[PDB]
Amino acid sequence: TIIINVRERIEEWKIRIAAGFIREGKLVAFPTETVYGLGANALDENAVKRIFEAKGRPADNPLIIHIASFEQLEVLAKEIPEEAEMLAKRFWPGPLTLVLPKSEVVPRVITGGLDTVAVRMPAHEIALKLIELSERPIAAPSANISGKPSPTSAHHVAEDFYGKIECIIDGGETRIGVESTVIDLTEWPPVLLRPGGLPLEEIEKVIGEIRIHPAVYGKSVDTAKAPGMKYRHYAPSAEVIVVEGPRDKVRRKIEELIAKFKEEGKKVGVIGSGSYDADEVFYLGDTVEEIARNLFKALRHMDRTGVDVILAEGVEEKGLGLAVMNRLRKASGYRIIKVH
């Protein structure tokens, strides 16, 4: 593995090293505005397949293709809806992923064997410069072991993958903290498949109101058009209990369980903004924007220690809040103590 520190400023030749790797059919981890992605050349079955391997990822769970130019979209998808052009021209480059019907050049191995392809234009200097220089599209899911928390720093990528992959570009920590929003434009009205860095409300202002796939709220799915729907994800080794309801009643409830779970002789931490006494306590932030930014730091911080159980305070499902609650809820496999 080669780690390229590009935190301070970007230096062309550094990124060129990695571009070579991408071309050589090797794996390269890169920063994005959302999470680090584990990238391969998208036009190379072999390269791509290396990704599912490294991750332990079912060939079933599709990948997202990252582009840097609007013209490469027409290359990867056919019969592009009008809405897609409107969302792309308003929100790309940005934390938005569009599901479209697949052009023929895109390998079935990327899409998990569907005529539907997921595409994004990452809003990050490096992610874009990498794509340009490597003169190829990059298929790139979250750069973690399948099932575990998402990476939001090179440290996180490295503790999962140092040794086992050729390259990690270190860009510092990712600005937003959670994955891109996936919108399905292969149906009318469109469907939100994964809540993300781009709030629903913003998208609904542009194109019409959209529907929400029940996957978002924990319906198991036989077949997945996008990542983060089928299989477990975002989950530490530990157990996670998410508690939601009004401020005090949630805090109160958290306190009962700390003590309850301490009596059973279990080590316990909490994620939230409420100030309890336990082995571990990670403060997520005052604002949702801040919470989204720290969510995986926290989940990984807890996992590295030896807490056997984690208690997460819920948050409002508006804005980035829809994503955090989605992630937490899917981390615990839907253990949600609802308080009234």
Ligand SMILES: C[C@@H](O)[C@H](N)C(=O)O
């Ligand atoms: C790697 C990053 O782009 C991730 N796949 C996302 O959609 O947010």
